[model samples]
Target: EIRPTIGQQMETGDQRFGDLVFRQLAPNVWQHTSYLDMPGFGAVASNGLIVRDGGRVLVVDTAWTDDQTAQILNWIKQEINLPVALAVVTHAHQDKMGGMDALHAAGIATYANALSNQLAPQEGMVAAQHSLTFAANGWVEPATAPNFGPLKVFYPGPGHTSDNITVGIDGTDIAFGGCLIKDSKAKSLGNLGDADTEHYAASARAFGAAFPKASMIVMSHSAPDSRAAITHTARMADKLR
Candidate 1:
């Protein structure tokens, strides 16, 4: 028998909201994009995912700022109509957890790994409400969010940041690598200020190994692509080490 789509595609085109745009990746998955104009880097785009599971929603990472994050939450409330029950910020970087306050304001329970929570306050980013440990053996479904399907979290060593983690929907090939996995077209290692130079390559390799069937690996700075991106990222990271 043919496999049904992981989720239905809801929107025809990107739903734009000023600097923020939401595009439905699958019936239950929406990719939210927002721009942050860094002084030296110009207009940088960051991405996050809004996924629906049963009657509730799961958010992966927040926008560049609280306002942008709130816009995402508002759009979800009006357009998606599902209450966000849980969120996981992959790291402590501003592009990933800058909107922690907005998520808290919405009364959504937020989560991040122990390292992430510890690093957030140093960067002046709000800490997630809960800190949970992930399995060492790759993707494992979260027991707390029962409405979710095979949504799982993984810590593939340290790459972009010591606190960086990856999120994936087990049944589907979709894996959100956050900033740890670079986009296919990425020219540089991006930011290494908090990166683990010695283990970046190994971490990328671990990330790929964890999601063997991952075809769609999402990143913070660009569009999602196949496993080739993961391979490309590992090669780039290897050079740094």
Candidate 2:
């Protein structure tokens, strides 16, 4: 399925970033899970988001490559039938920066914390094309109304990376905690390669509080709105903190 069908799941079998599934978790809000086989890490499921209103869409993150991001844009152009005006990378990890190459070529505006932008190159990933000038000293977001919609987004301190961010759709009570917050089924903190255990949990808690009413929590590696995803992570963060 090229364009998201709104209330269904879509599977596109391409190459590189094939084995992809996109799910619409709420009206105007959708989730994309791309399955990638990491040589040393085994199979990993990476998550993304598509937030659309009318014909305007904003992609939350990309898959593992330009080809992968292209496939998604192809589907969006064909299905969602909207012109994507922006793409946002929540962090500097490859899963977040992989599709950046395509977004840049397409002239699609993409933005991240200036830190995320800086860190991508520092981490050896291609720098994203989108631009928003700000110091890496702290978080970044539009100083006025949210760009795509009534969304609350920020880099609520580092957890998954020094650049991880949280995005919440205002009228929907939904929050995308990115990789900073673990999923509902996690027994132990999942990945700590770049995670600061001490600040990860507190950052998770701090981020969630900014959008407290969100009941549907979406993480990078799991299904969106996992019943107690945030609650579980908050509890775990408490112990870790």
Superposed on all Cα atoms, the candidates' RMSDs to the truth, in angstroms, are 6.6, 5.2
Worst 10 residues of 2 by lDDT: 1-10
lDDT of each: 0.80, 0.71
Top candidate when judged by TM-score against the true structure: 1
Residue 234 lDDT in model 1? Answer: 92
- Candidate 1 regions off by >4 Å? 1-12, 136-148
My TM-score estimates for the predictions, one after another, are 0.89, 0.84
Cα-based lDDT at residue 80, candidate 1? 77
lDDT of 1 by residue, 51-94 (tens): 88878888999998999999999889898798898888999988
Candidate 2 residue 80 Cα shift, in angstroms, is 1.0
lDDT of candidate model 2 versus the reference: 0.71
Q: Single out the weakest 10-residue window by summed lDDT for candidate 1.
A: 1-10
